[model samples]
Target chain A: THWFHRNPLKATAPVSFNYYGVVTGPSASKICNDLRSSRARLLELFTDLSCNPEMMKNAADSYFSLLQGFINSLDESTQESKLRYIQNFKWTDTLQGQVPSAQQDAVFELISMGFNVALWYTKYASRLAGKENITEDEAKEVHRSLKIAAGIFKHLKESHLPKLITPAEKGRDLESRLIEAYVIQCQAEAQEVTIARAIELKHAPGLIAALAYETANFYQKADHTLSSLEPAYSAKWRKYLHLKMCFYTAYAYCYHGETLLASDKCGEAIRSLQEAEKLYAKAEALCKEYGETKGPGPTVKPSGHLFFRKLGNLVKNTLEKCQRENGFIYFQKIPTEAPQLELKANYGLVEPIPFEFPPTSVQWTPETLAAFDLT
Target chain B: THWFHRNPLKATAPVSFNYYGVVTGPSASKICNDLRSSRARLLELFTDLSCNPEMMKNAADSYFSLLQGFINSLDESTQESKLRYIQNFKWTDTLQGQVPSAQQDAVFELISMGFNVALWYTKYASRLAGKENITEDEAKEVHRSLKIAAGIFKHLKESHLPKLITPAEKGRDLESRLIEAYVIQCQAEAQEVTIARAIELKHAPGLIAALAYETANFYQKADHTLSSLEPAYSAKWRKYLHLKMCFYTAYAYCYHGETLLASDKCGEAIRSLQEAEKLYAKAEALCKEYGETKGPGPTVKPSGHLFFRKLGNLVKNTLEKCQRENGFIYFQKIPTEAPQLELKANYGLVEPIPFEFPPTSVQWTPETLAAFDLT
Candidate 1:
């Protein structure tokens, strides 16, 4: 039995969600049904779209455009749209035409779906007229719909994928290709753009992920594919690759972690680094597989040459060394043999000359070197 | 016939030239004669030392070591010892112990004399103590002593032939070899020692100067003397030499002009550059001389290819570009684009996808590109 049919409680005027009030007698049941159906459909569509790559890829651009248009058409002051239009939408796998690429198409579809879902909750629900004194249940339903919509909206708005879709001829592996393309695009952007701007644009989440993935890719290539080369070539390749990966990963973790931490999500940041370490380990394993017999014993090259593997070791060693030698962490006291020349110059002549001494002379002992060993 | 006996009024203190306050009563009348006699003896000794290159070289090092020791001993508490030590000294080329090279020995003796004179003025006359109320005559004497000392100091410090002194025994020039050895030694120290600890040992000034000079020397050799060639070699050579001369000349002018900017004695600096330009022109002319008929073109390389030269240019260009484009200068800016990738995995996507674009693409425009000459 319908809610209206079960209880014939009615009022002389229309009501709102904030308090216990009345609904207009003739239209009350229809309004209730419309609101209920709209919510159910919105949830169903969101769940389906999110899970289906093909459907998402096909409709992403159009959906995004439609959402933009819908938003644009709203009253600038209140930004409201028609709820009826939201309730009538359908989701299907049908492609309208050729798109740019599979990856591009997928992003476009995801963004579109997100936009449509958000518009339904934020603009359409807000447009619905109601009395000030409505029931708490009704008010709660409205709040839930609005919030879900906002989440979808924010996700869509912050995404960097273009609206255009790739042609169907791009092949069946469009989904994977799209992912790779997006990864490359994100990496290029991250390398060239500043951290603050990424955060300001609310693009940090995607950028951080892109950096991690890129780092993983480089590690895999350096460790796996380059392992079969001559010892010298392999070593050099590993060094270059490791350096690149370490620098990028460190940068991403630092900047992205700071962004997340500022928002009180320190746990998430720690998790991100942990995830990066897994990839770092994979790179290190590959490097060691090739580098095992290549070392010149005591005269081995610096560990920083190995990139991610060495970098992790370096950071760990630095911290540990600081603790053991200086009796503290966080690098509060620069050691007596700190690397800065200006500081040494200001203190007095420890060495009348600069740069001729070995690392050992500057307190870079075997223990410190051991800290940098991944094994 | 003597001026002291000619007029009783004038004899009181020889108020006109006012040489009295600089020395005690008996010493006052004899100082002028002492200076005249000292000059003749110094000249003869310099001539004799010039005949022995090994002795000259040894004298230079010994004198430099003494100067270093004196400077090092000065502290905030014991400034008076410095004054007394400087007052009773007279500079002569009496190689009382040993000498190394004739050319170097002569130069060293002259330099020692100049150093003594400069120390006298810097210590005593310029920093006169117990001055309840000095008479005009006494004040004039102080000024005269300081002025004379400063004049001679500038002349000696500004000369550059000291480094060209060659020992008769060795095929290589002694001064140049010594400087090279010193540079190497300084470089070693800079690399091995902690600046803070060095400062604590009171070797701060020497360490700093050693590092700076050695760095300059290394760059010089890399740009000019090294076998491997860089694109900016010639221009870098010119710039380095010019900068070195500028610093030395600036030092001389600091004493004479009594100010950094007003020191018009930068003629040496200008002359050095003029000489460097002529050398550069000769190199260019040779390139042209050979290229006129054989090579592709003159291949006139500006000092932009060498690492340091390029680094300098990079800094300068970046600063200028930032100022012009952003209307301000800052140590770091939110990169116009993301510096790392933001990646995400859409459902069923095999790989992670990037979510950022390149900075160039992010902020590209026909006008901006044209402004950068990129168009």
Candidate 2:
């Protein structure tokens, strides 16, 4: 634990940001090795982007400046190799089809970095607000970088996803297709960050809910579709399904919890939080095992480490606070997006005794229909 | 079977609609009996509003005509006695507090009728569209009706819901409050019909998903919120939760399947179809036992006897057909609002499974992150 605190990766990760997976250590694949290095930088950059009241402007300015440099570094040709620049993109073990450049992983880094930075602002900008007065110029520099980041994702989803599925494997399943399945997953994840932006920019609860629901829908279906894999290439990929699905399910509940809390229904909100906690524990369970020698799906299946647990705990706590508040539970700094870290265990709300509803002598009839004047 | 066919209830029900249970006979309370009768009209009106090209216009026209006369007949002062006019108004097993007129239920009838009529137009209007050129004046009429229906729902959710929880139930729970929880459900369900109107009229997939997701969300939480009750008002009320949840769950999956299918992912669509089937079956399972009698919550539950199973089977069958279409798997007639009759068992993926990937010797690294300048 002490070593982890000293670890550079631990230091730079934004405090509130739930790291999806840890990206450390090098790999044998040229692409994997390269992204691991790039990923380390992203950790630093994400932290740079994190707001600090003392050096808030410096951090925001440096963050944008740093992102632009990375953007300029990305050439279409480089991006074409499908190197994902996002921190979460390194699909460890095998590309299903490998290219020497850490290019695809690099591209993912971009997608992932923009996702984090944007979320950072949307989530914490209020704190920076009256303080740094950012959004100065719509933070166009970062927004442009984000546009590029989003464009990279759009570009990949549009043209590259089909290729991600290896053609030689065509008479059969491909790592690429499995990876391609994530197109919607990535789309949903990125939208979550945008949802944060809407919140930070202070959009309507209706709009916020509208956005979250779509993501929840997409993520829910993503879990089901992943189950169809005739064992997605291997047991490890199968594990990826478990990890991601647990995360997705836990996340979906988080969205629903926020949504219910936004409306008049506290009764339902508390349960969503309850489910969120249980599911988050399940997600953590998925990460308990480790495999280093073989490649797996999720590009970074265990990368986020306890990310789900972190957010899960947040929701659980927030729900408790939300329950008896004397006002509308509007966008109340839900636990998932909170700027702190904690993890814990099972909460209550279980009934022991079984129940059977008592029977009735109820019946339907012509007498009933007579009042409405039906045939 | 012969009696059922001869029965007007059987005649008007969309041939495709699946009936989970049979509603018949009598009950004890004045309110229960009255609402059951009120319920009988809802069943009829729901049928009359069904869409089949040959008589789509006739069904929709007479449906509204029949409802208007009832609306005018309502004397609010008398309605307080709970004399519901159209359909969907009766929230009685007992009023907990008698208003002499059961006006709340009567008002509910107005809200419910508008809901049904508005949905009738929105859902079937497309069938009537190329059939009768009904778009000229009726689109506006149906749209207006839907708006009113939605408005009525909103009004009730905003103001009346708190009242629905019986004041008498005191500190713990109440039938009225439980009924009130369903305001969102009714609102969302009625909105589904309007969504069909939007889809038929040509709306964006983004908007489609947004509308469906919120409805899906409301429906999902409605299920959870129902569990919070201490064995809701009665067996009938407990039964109501199960019935409504089953319908809502199946319906949520139905919308999600369409959303995924729309995005060009056939794999997930089929599974959602798979889920809707299980969920609908679950809904029917809720009806495996039937009971009568008593006062309870969700005033109008025991209403949709077979609604869930109907859509459930539709999606199940549609999904089967959806699986092997060599053509792109588009949003082919998902069942939330469809008019037809067909039943069949399950389907599997077009791409049959059973394939394996050759192994690799991938390894995690200490060498990878070495290149990045860590803090």
Candidate 3:
């Protein structure tokens, strides 16, 4: 019990896991060496005079420490949930906020390896959970990683955007809308992450009770923001962005509905379930509207919740349980607890910016039709 | 007589040379198979119903025929230059131009193989000549190729842009300026291709005598158009565009300047050379101007001319000859025959639109540095 009480980060420190290779996987030396070189490049970029080196040095140091920490952690993967929590602090977010308004946008697109780390671990964990590929050990690690990710995105939304993005004029344009969409998307996605975390905690009442309402709030913001981007939907990757927003909104409602049923709240569960179905139906319409190439397809993997489909059927299962209780085999207990599950960063040894853009769009018109006149 | 009598395209035809590998090259079947798959993808993208098939079919058929022609030509590298010349006709370019005012931008960019063909042959031929890797056989091939590329860019300028670009309001914002800059850059690049072409043909007064002036005219348009983008230089890839425009302008003037001296145009030649040196100085300044990450480096290779450096020496040699003639060495023999040399496209089959995007950019401010405060 005493050993178990040690911080989770103790598991991540170099001394705990097999830093020198136990059996399988890449040699620790290679990975750590490369990560060191990569962190050096990030530091070099920060220190370069062309950038505001004095201001960015902290981001540089913190980023370097994280890389070094992760490389050391990678050489040993069993770092417990609480131990790695030390890495979750958003100094860059705080620095950006504290900075003068004029100086704030400087690092807006500086592209920390942190976001890349967040996406990679999230995708990898989702794949493991969705494909049912994880062993118990992995599930535990993933559960912790997702918790870390929830914190990561929460800070990003709360700490990062409030400092970085400023509202523009009438045509805030595609960029402003996309920035808005992603922040709200992060908010929505983070709410579900807490649901997953709530499932693991013995004392997560606050997280659970607020889960459905907070998640709905996040989804509504995202839905409203992304909806305004209708004109740009066909313009670039905006189509996929819209599809994902709808898909995630549907899943959040379905899970929220399921958790309520688990707590034996039948009426509320059914109402939420009905709305979930509608969201899903609307998402399907978008999938059809864009058709094969531009629509929601197998390639557009769900990043929000990999195991949502199983949760979707939970309402029906619980209704049957409620009916069996009516047979007087037992009295149905009114559930008051929320259910949960939690999941999911970087560079280079010259990190490239991890974003995308579109310069020109395909313009299809009658004149274009006559020009290609193929018949 | 037989040697002199062979048609310019004879070296390019099927019967003239080995279609099979000469011990050190890719096998014919591999290249041809890959090209077929590639053209198939391009055709497939056009045929899909999300796009109008009727208007796009000509582009596809011509693209297919050209792919087939190239594949067939692959089975024979020197298929008559004339055999391949037939494919140069752009149904898309013509279509865009002839299409109704509303329809003009339809395929304004559906310019397929012409540009790829232009850049590829230009590099391949320059490699053949510059490295002493070229024999007379290769020289003859390059002669025809530059002739072809010059025509390719000429038509692309005359045929493509007038249809695609519309005059916009002040600050159609950065995108409008970017569009203008790129089109004018294209116009300037094409003029140099013609100068290279003039060097090859027999009676090319208009092409050669006016070389420096016409090129300067092209340079002025590019300079005027691109300089307006100074505000956006820090915004995206506009700096690279500016640096490259200056670099290409420098080389074009350098070579054209040297040629005029050889042709006994003393007054014009030296003036051209002086302007070229000034341009190269400006380009060098820009190269150093944005020393951080974005400006000129090995990434954007100068295609306008690689051999233009030694041409600076040529002007000196010509001046000496002109001096010798002044004392009277039978009036310095002007370069009579327009100088000429030439080359050919492909494997892997990728027909990705040959364009680029900035992806993401940094926005820095002085206040952010203070927020990030360090020693």
lDDT tens string, model 2, A1-375? 000000011112222212223322122122233333444544554456453323432343333333332233333334332212333232212323232112233333333343343334322322232233445343333333323333433443444334332232321212234333344444444454455466466555445545645555555565565555544334454454455456545545555556566674555665565565566566666655423323333333334333334343444444345533411111222234321112211211111112111121121112221222111
Badly placed stretches (over 4 Å) of model 1 are: A1-253, A256-375, B1-91, B94-144, B150-375
Worst 10 residues of 2 chain B by lDDT: B1-10
- lDDT (0 to 1) per candidate: 0.31, 0.38, 0.38
* CAPRI-style grade of the A/B interface in model 2: incorrect
Q: Candidate 3 at residue B224, lDDT?
A: 64
Report how far residue A178 has shifted in candidate 2, in Å: 46
Listed per prediction, chain B TM-scores read: 0.20, 0.36, 0.35
lDDT of 3 by residue, A124-208 (tens): 4344445434365655444444444444444444444454334432222113443444444443443444444444443233334
- The residue ranges of model 3 lying beyond 4 angstroms of the native Cα positions read A1-131, A135-213, A226-275, A287-298, A301-375, B1-375
lDDT of 3 by residue, B299-331 (tens): 333333333334435544644545333211112
Error of 2 at B140 (Å): 7.5
Q: What is the C-alpha RMSD of each candidate to the true structure, in Å?
A: 33.2, 39.2, 40.4
lDDT per residue (tens digit) for residues A163-238 in model 1:
3334322221122332232222222222222332333344644454354435435444534544543444235434
Q: Higher TM-score: candidate 1 or 3?
A: 3
- In model 2, the runs with Cα more than 4 Å from the true position are A1-375, B1-179, B199-210, B223-238, B258-266, B287-375
Q: Residue B364: error of model 2 in Å? A: 85
Q: Which candidate do you rate higher for lDDT, 1 or 2?
A: 2
